[PDB]
Amino acid sequence: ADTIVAVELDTYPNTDIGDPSYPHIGIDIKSVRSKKTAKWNMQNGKVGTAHIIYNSVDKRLSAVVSYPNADSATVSYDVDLDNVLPEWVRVGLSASTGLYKETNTILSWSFTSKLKSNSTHETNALHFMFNQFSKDQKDLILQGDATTGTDGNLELTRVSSNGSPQGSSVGRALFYAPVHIWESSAVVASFEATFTFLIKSPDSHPADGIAFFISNIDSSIPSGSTGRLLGLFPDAN
Amino acid sequence: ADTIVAVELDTYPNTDIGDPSYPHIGIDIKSVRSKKTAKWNMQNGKVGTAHIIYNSVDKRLSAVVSYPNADSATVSYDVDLDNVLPEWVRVGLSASTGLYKETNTILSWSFTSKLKSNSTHETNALHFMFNQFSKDQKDLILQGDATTGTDGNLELTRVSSNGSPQGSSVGRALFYAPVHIWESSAVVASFEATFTFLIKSPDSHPADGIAFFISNIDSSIPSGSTGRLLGLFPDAN
Amino acid sequence: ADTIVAVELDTYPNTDIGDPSYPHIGIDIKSVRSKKTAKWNMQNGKVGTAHIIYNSVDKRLSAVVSYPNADSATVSYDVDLDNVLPEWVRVGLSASTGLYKETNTILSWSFTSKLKSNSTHETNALHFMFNQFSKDQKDLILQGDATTGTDGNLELTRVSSNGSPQGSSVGRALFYAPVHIWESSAVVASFEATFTFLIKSPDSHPADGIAFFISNIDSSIPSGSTGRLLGLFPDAN
Amino acid sequence: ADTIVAVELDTYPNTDIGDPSYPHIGIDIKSVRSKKTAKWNMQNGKVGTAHIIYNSVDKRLSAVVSYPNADSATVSYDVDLDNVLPEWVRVGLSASTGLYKETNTILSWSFTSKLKSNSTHETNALHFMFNQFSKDQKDLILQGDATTGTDGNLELTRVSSNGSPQGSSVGRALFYAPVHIWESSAVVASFEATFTFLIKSPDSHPADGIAFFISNIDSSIPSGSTGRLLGLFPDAN
Numbered sequence: 044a045d046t047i048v049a050v051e052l053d054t055y056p057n058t059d060i061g062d063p064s065y066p067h068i069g070i071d072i073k074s075v076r077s078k079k080t081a082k083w084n085m086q087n088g089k090v091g092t093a094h095i096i097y098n099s100v101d102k103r104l105s106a107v108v109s110y111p112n113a114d115s116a117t118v119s120y121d122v123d124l125d126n127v128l129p130e131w132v133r134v135g136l137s138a139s140t141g142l143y144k145e146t147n148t149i150l151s152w153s154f155t156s157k158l159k160s161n162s163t164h165e166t167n168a169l170h171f172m173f174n175q176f177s178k179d180q181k182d183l184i185l186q187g188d189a190t191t192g193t194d195g196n197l198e199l200t201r202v203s204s205n206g207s208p209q210g211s212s213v214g215r216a217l218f219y220a221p222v223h224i225w226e227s228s229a230v231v232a233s234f235e236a237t238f239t240f241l242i243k244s245p246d247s248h249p250a251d252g253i254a255f256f257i258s259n260i261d262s263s264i265p266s267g268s269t270g271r272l273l274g275l276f277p278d279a280n
Numbered sequence: 281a282d283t284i285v286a287v288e289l290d291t292y293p294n295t296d297i298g299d300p301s302y303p304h305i306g307i308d309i310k311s312v313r314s315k316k317t318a319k320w321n322m323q324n325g326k327v328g329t330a331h332i333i334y335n336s337v338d339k340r341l342s343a344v345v346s347y348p349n350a351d352s353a354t355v356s357y358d359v360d361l362d363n364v365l366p367e368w369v370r371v372g373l374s375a376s377t378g379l380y381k382e383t384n385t386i387l388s389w390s391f392t393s394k395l396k397s398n399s400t401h402e403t404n405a406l407h408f409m410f411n412q413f414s415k416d417q418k419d420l421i422l423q424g425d426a427t428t429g430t431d432g433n434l435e436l437t438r439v440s441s442n443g444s445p446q447g448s449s450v451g452r453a454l455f456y457a458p459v460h461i462w463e464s465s466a467v468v469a470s471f472e473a474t475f476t477f478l479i480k481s482p483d484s485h486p487a488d489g490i491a492f493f494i495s496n497i498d499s500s501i502p503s504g505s506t507g508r509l510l511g512l513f514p515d516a517n
Numbered sequence: 518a519d520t521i522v523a524v525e526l527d528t529y530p531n532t533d534i535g536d537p538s539y540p541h542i543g544i545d546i547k548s549v550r551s552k553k554t555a556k557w558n559m560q561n562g563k564v565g566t567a568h569i570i571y572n573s574v575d576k577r578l579s580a581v582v583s584y585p586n587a588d589s590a591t592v593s594y595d596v597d598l599d600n601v602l603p604e605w606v607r608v609g610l611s612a613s614t615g616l617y618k619e620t621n622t623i624l625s626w627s628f629t630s631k632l633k634s635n636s637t638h639e640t641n642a643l644h645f646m647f648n649q650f651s652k653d654q655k656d657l658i659l660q661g662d663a664t665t666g667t668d669g670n671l672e673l674t675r676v677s678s679n680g681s682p683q684g685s686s687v688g689r690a691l692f693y694a695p696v697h698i699w700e701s702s703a704v705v706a707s708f709e710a711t712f713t714f715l716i717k718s719p720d721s722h723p724a725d726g727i728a729f730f731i732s733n734i735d736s737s738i739p740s741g742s743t744g745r746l747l748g749l750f751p752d753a754n
Numbered sequence: 755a756d757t758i759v760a761v762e763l764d765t766y767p768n769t770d771i772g773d774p775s776y777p778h779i780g781i782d783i784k785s786v787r788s789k790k791t792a793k794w795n796m797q798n799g800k801v802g803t804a805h806i807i808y809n810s811v812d813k814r815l816s817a818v819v820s821y822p823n824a825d826s827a828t829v830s831y832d833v834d835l836d837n838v839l840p841e842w843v844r845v846g847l848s849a850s851t852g853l854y855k856e857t858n859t860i861l862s863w864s865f866t867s868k869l870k871s872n873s874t875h876e877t878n879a880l881h882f883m884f885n886q887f888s889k890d891q892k893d894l895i896l897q898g899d900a901t902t903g904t905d906g907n908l909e910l911t912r913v914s915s916n917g918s919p920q921g922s923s924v925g926r927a928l929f930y931a932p933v934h935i936w937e938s939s940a941v942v943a944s945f946e947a948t949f950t951f952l953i954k955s956p957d958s959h960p961a962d963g964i965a966f967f968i969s970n971i972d973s974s975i976p977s978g979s980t981g982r983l984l985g986l987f988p989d990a991n
């Protein structure tokens with residue numbers, strides 16, 4: 044179908060598809076089946092920050108989610124992304140809900156990808172940063188339930204006007220421009236993505252999470268991906 | 281029609297529309313009629329570098345074209361670009377020929393725009409750099425005669441396979457993503473664009489030039505803009 | 518008589534040396550008397566942001582001070598800094614109180630310097646940023662009363678443990694490294710600086726101010742410079 | 755016994771201290787004997803590029819050396835540098851010859867250091883770049899035989915006016931400022947370095963090599979370090 048690499052933040056365990064029985068962060072390579080996961084003491088109603096980072100050299104893909112004044116969960120998995128991904132991709136943030144529900148507000152999102160070549164400073168590069176989202180973001184492709192303008196914030200999931208979240212929503216947000224993520228002849232290729240989010244839920248149990256993801260250029264939301272699939276994968280299979 | 285701000289490099293004087301009688305650089309605000317110009321000792325067959333820079337603070341738009349081991353022509357004109365331009369634009373390089381002809385090879389092109397807001401480091405930003413152009417550039421919108429892949433270079437104007445240029449060509453190249461160039465509430469807005477080019481002509485007199493330009497999102501090439509209009513303006517009027 | 522260039526922020530108008538009546542920002546090029554100024558609707562106890570930007574192309578030095586939800590005071594002055602300044606400088610911040618007094622608290626400070634040249638981005642550069650000041654900052658030079666570590670802030674003037682400002686206080690903080698501020702052979706020579714500050718006085722009347730300055734590598738506080746001279750100038754010439 | 759971490763590039767294998775037979779690159783963590791290495795198909799007289807990249811999340815230090823149109827030699831090592839290194843270091847380059855000798859010419863060198871934290875990009879950072887070395891570089895610390903200004907290059911080992919390398923030579927160059935390399939409270943602590951170099955010997959056999967190193971602020975050349983120790987380590991322990 045469409046190739047998907049993503050870093051997932053399960054607020055909701057899904058022991059039927061494999062997810063551990065605790066709020067976790069994890070690395071998904073073409074399958075909601077995480078190839079590596081780590082325990083995340085999630086904080087309800089607090090603004091937190093995720094850093095994603097990968098370099099050709101280590102071939103190690105990494106992520107750190109962390110709150111102020113709080114321990115930070117980290118995950119790392121050796122993968123070679125030119126085998127996996129197409130030469131041109133498009134990056135973005137995705138998030139969704141199920142029975143249980145949560146606010147998936149993205150307060151800020153940045154990202155940087157460099158292609159340093161065999162001759163140095165013959166590099167190629169793209170960096171893009173949002174610390175507030177305007178009422179109309181010409182350069183974000185918004186998919187599903189995604190809405191901007193609410194308090195200068197990106198809401199990937201749907202929320203009622205009073206501020207309570209709603210269930211069984213998928214919204215997904217993408218950068219307008221395609222990213223040349225890797226090349227046949229580059230000595231180092233790298234890419235970092237940082238984004239801060241606010242997850243607050245009225246219910247004691249929230250669901251399902253946020254994921255930063257990378258896919259081929261022409262990606263649209265999978266049918267019936269609402270819930271534990273996070274708007275990234277069509278099937279747990 | 282479509283609003284156009286651009287820095288022009290006339291290799292060919294056009295004294296019928298106003299252009300001075302020497303190879304010049306100049307500032308065009310919605311009219312091929314340059315509002316300020318400066319003398320440029322152009323160098324045939326040598327790689328040269330243009331720097332464009334503008335900040336909300338000075339409200340002064342500036343450009344410098346310069347060769348290695350050679351004097352550098354500079355131009356500057358006070359303009360306030362939120363009055364002129366739409367809130368969202370799209371940037372790019374344009375170039376064309378007439379009776380006389382030239383190669384308009386773009387060896388590299390970068391650009392950066394920042395929106396620092398009334399609260400600091402609540403900024404918004406986009407930077408993008410090409411030091412080589414691949415056979416297929418997914419993220420460049422190519423218009424008219426524009427072609428990439430030839431020796432890792434962007435050729436805005438048409439060129440025969442042996443390497444000689446051809447006449448009465450317009451090619452124009454644009455960044456896929458729209459640039460949020462200014463905002464109603466930002467204490468400093470700024471944007472810098474740098475690009476290196478190679479102009480070589482078999483004929484003693486070459487024509488017409490290269491221009492970096494900014495326009496509304498939906499800009500396409502004007503009809504009959506080939507020649508002294510540089511693929512930017514429909515009429516000298 | 519070390520050479521010194523600066524962007525000053527006067528909370529105290531010293532009418533005999535030329536300070537306008539109203540609290541102003543100004544450009545001080547080699548003398549305390551400001552070459553140009555602009556009215557500044559200062560806000561007591563609110564954090565503000567200073568932006569400062571100059572480049573070899575415009576040859577305009579300029580600056581904007583700005584509080585949230587309030588107009589921003591701006592100023593510009595056409596000056597060629599390679600005439601005025603040595604080839605190699607140190608950059609830094611200064612502030613001072615006299616009979617009247619204020620809290621000169623620096624919350625954050627960053628600075629960029631590029632020497633782009635004729636070739637394909639064969640430039641020389643330096644950038645540094647502080648959103649928190651550590652308890653021992655060994656890459657700042659601390660001069661006078663200046664202190665770090667309290668709340669992660671830089672305090673250029675002396676304050677009590679309760680927080681009360683003191684009178685007749687003078688403090689400077691310089692980046693440890695020397696900056697290559699201009700070159701004989703570089704086609705453009707941009708440099709940008711940004712910083713935030715907190716100014717609060719119990720008093721009806723606060724004094725004197727903060728200034729971003731640039732001077733020689735060997736620069737030290739001029740004697741008897743507390744008060745009107747902001748730790749910058751020996752005399753009021 | 756100053757503390758020191760480094761990425762070494764051996765043209766001369768010193769088999770008794772563990773250098774493999776073949777010319778190698780390696781990670782030297784607190785001792786000259788390399789913790790891990792990889793074969794390097796060195797090219798005489800051709801400029802090459804070294805890339806070096808480490809981050810607190812992976813906790814992997816790694817590096818790639820690369821010539822145009824040739825495979826690139828790579829190496830990695832899992833090490834937690836805040837255990838090994840002091841909180842505040844200086845970075846720099848070192849190289850040396852012994853009985854056998856080579857030209858250790860540094861054409862260009864850049865370095866980035868970020869201390870991203872838990873908050874919304876409230877980080878601390880430093881970046882610097884050199885594509886040309888000036889005649890007097892007063893923000894490099896020059897140690898040993900190291901010299902600037904010849905062709906705009908850095909020469910870490912001594913060379914004649916004709917260009918002939920010399921034997922038993924040792925040279926280091928450090929950035930003037932101290933780097934905050936890690937923090938107790940920072941959630942990630944990335945740092946990246948890049949540099950190009952020219953290595954040429956008249957001989958069949960060249961020696962010894964160049965190394966990027968990190969050490970304490972007060973670090974100076976260890977005595978008797980020419981030859982195998984590359985200006986880095988007092989002893990071969």
Ligand SMILES: O=C(NCCOCCO[C@H]1O[C@H](CO)[C@@H](O)[C@H](O)[C@@H]1O)c1ccc2ccc3ccc(C(=O)NCCOCCO[C@H]4O[C@H](CO)[C@@H](O)[C@H](O)[C@@H]4O)nc3c2n1
Nearest residue numbers: 529531614615616617618684685723724725743744745746
């Ligand atoms: O008004 C006072 N007693 C009378 C004489 O003090 C001069 C001010 O009175 C002014 O009005 C009087 C009435 O017409 C005149 O008789 C004076 O000749 C003067 O013009 C007086 C009473 C208490 C004081 C306590 C601590 C102090 C520390 C330093 C200075 C000083 O060196 N101060 C020197 C003089 O005071 C102002 C200088 O300003 C200084 O302090 C300012 C504080 O903002 C700075 O802006 C400025 O750069 C200077 O450093 N002063 C005091 C001080 N002065």
Ligand SMILES: O=C(NCCOCCO[C@H]1O[C@H](CO)[C@@H](O)[C@H](O)[C@@H]1O)c1ccc2ccc3ccc(C(=O)NCCOCCO[C@H]4O[C@H](CO)[C@@H](O)[C@H](O)[C@@H]4O)nc3c2n1
Nearest residue numbers: 766768851852853854855921922960961962980981982983
């Ligand atoms: O081979 C020579 N004459 C014989 C004795 O020289 C030792 C090498 O001969 C080797 O083989 C011989 C035959 O089996 C043995 O009898 C020796 O005991 C030794 O193992 C000889 C002839 C001329 C010389 C001229 C200038 C010099 C400067 C310094 C040194 C030195 O300190 N040199 C010390 C010894 O030479 C190698 C050290 O390598 C040094 O130089 C290398 C150059 O790459 C570095 O890699 C390395 O780290 C060292 O600094 N040597 C010379 C030197 N040596």
Ligand SMILES: [Ca+2]
Nearest residue numbers: 053055057251
């Ligand atoms: Ca889940």
Ligand SMILES: [Ca+2]
Nearest residue numbers: 290292294488
């Ligand atoms: Ca023309």
Ligand SMILES: [Ca+2]
Nearest residue numbers: 527529530531
């Ligand atoms: Ca004053």
Ligand SMILES: [Ca+2]
Nearest residue numbers: 764766767768
């Ligand atoms: Ca060796």
Ligand SMILES: [Mn+2]
Nearest residue numbers: 051053062075
């Ligand atoms: Mn899952």
Ligand SMILES: [Mn+2]
Nearest residue numbers: 288290299312
């Ligand atoms: Mn014209």
Ligand SMILES: [Mn+2]
Nearest residue numbers: 527536543551
């Ligand atoms: Mn003043």
Ligand SMILES: [Mn+2]
Nearest residue numbers: 764773780788
């Ligand atoms: Mn070795």
